[PDB]
Amino acid sequence: SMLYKELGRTGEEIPALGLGTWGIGGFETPDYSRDEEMVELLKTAIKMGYTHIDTAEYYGGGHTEELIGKAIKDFRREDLFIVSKVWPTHLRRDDLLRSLENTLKRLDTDYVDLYLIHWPNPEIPLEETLSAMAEGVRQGLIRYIGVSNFDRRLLEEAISKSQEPIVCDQVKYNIEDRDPERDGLLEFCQKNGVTLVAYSPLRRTLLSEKTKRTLEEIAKNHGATIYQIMLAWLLAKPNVVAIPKAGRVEHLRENLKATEIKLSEEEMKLLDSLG
Numbered sequence: 022s023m024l025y026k027e028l029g030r031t032g033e034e035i036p037a038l039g040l041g042t043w044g045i046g047g048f049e050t051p052d053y054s055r056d057e058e059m060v061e062l063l064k065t066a067i068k069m070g071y072t073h074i075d076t077a078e079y080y081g082g083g084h085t086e087e088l089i090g091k092a093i094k095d096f097r098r099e100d101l102f103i104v105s106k107v108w109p110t111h112l113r114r115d116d117l118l119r120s121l122e123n124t125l126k127r128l129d130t131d132y133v134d135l136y137l138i139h140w141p142n143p144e145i146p147l148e149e150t151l152s153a154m155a156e157g158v159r160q161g162l163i164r165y166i167g168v169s170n171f172d173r174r175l176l177e178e179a180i181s182k183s184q185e186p187i188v189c190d191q192v193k194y195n196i197e198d199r200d201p202e203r204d205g206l207l208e209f210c211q212k213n214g215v216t217l218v219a220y221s222p223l224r225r226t227l228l229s230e231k232t233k234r235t236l237e238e239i240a241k242n243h244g245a246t247i248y249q250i251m252l253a254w255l256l257a258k259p260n261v262v263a264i265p266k267a268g269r270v271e272h273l274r275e276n277l278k279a280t281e282i283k284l285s286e287e288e289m290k291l292l293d294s295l296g
């Protein structure tokens with residue numbers, strides 16, 4: 022079953038595995054050809070306990086949110102934690118509020134639980150963007166705000182310009198990609214009450230031979246796959262949650278079992294040393 026962790030300093034616990042939705046209903050453009058299959062996969066994921074759903078206005082050109090919108094109707098809205106994101110072309114005040122409105126129309130819901138700046142746009146003042154996001158919070162359209170792909174220095178800047186708390190920073194983090202460690206970002210999050218949300222937590226399964234030999238030994242000792250070990254490694258870290266993409270039932274099932282793996286201190290030190 023699903024491991025839960027506190028989001029930021031909110032007093033609220035969320036599933037420590039999110040459901041990644043990139044690819045569902047298309048990538049950069051809408052793909053309508055598998056809509057029924059995709060809605061059924063989303064429903065199955067949610068029923069298995071994947072109630073934290075990660076999406077974005079860019080995903081499937083808006084169509085990913087539309088498919089999520091159909092799938093969530095089989096459940097109680099308040100039981101779900103839905104994350105969306107505004108694309109860097111839309112970070113000026115009027116464009117952001119329009120993006121938010123359109124995201125809510127596609128999801129067919131009255132609010133998102135978490136709304137993220139998807140990527141920074143250096144041309145648009147952060148204070149403007151964050152003030153627009155606070156308008157959404159004040160109106161009840163957003164519960165919490167956060168950011169994505171912000172290094173430590175830009176997260177610090179956002180925190181200083183934001184009326185609302187920044188509850189998370191969603192960045193790439195996995196057994197080979199250690200930019201958040203080298204940047205001091207993970208330490209900063211852990212010391213300042215910010216959740217680090219690791220996307221591409223399996224590195225899209227593209228790993229080196231050296232990494233693979235270490236993971237194989239640990240996996241064997243736990244009767245697990247190398248990917249379950251990669252997830253357990255992230256989830257062992259304070260303030261870290263992960264968003265795998267699992268477009269099939271086998272991977273949904275496997276990744277959920279990873280939340281039960283208890284890595285030893287020496288296993289953690291060996292894994293830490295692979296980057």
Ligand SMILES: NC(=O)c1ccc[n+]([C@@H]2O[C@H](COP(=O)([O-])OP(=O)(O)OC[C@H]3O[C@@H](n4cnc5c(N)ncnc54)[C@H](OP(=O)(O)O)[C@@H]3O)[C@@H](O)[C@H]2O)c1
Binds near residue numbers: 075169191248265273
């Ligand atoms: N904020 C951002 O800029 C940003 C950027 C990238 C991604 N994201 C979010 O993070 C999610 C994850 O990103 P990602 O797709 O790059 O990362 P990922 O989870 O590291 O890689 C996904 C790949 O791993 C496979 N997989 C999943 N579980 C597996 C298992 N147990 N065994 C073997 N293979 C497995 C999937 O295959 P199947 O699908 O066939 O199971 C898929 O090909 C995205 O959907 C998105 O929601 C956010």
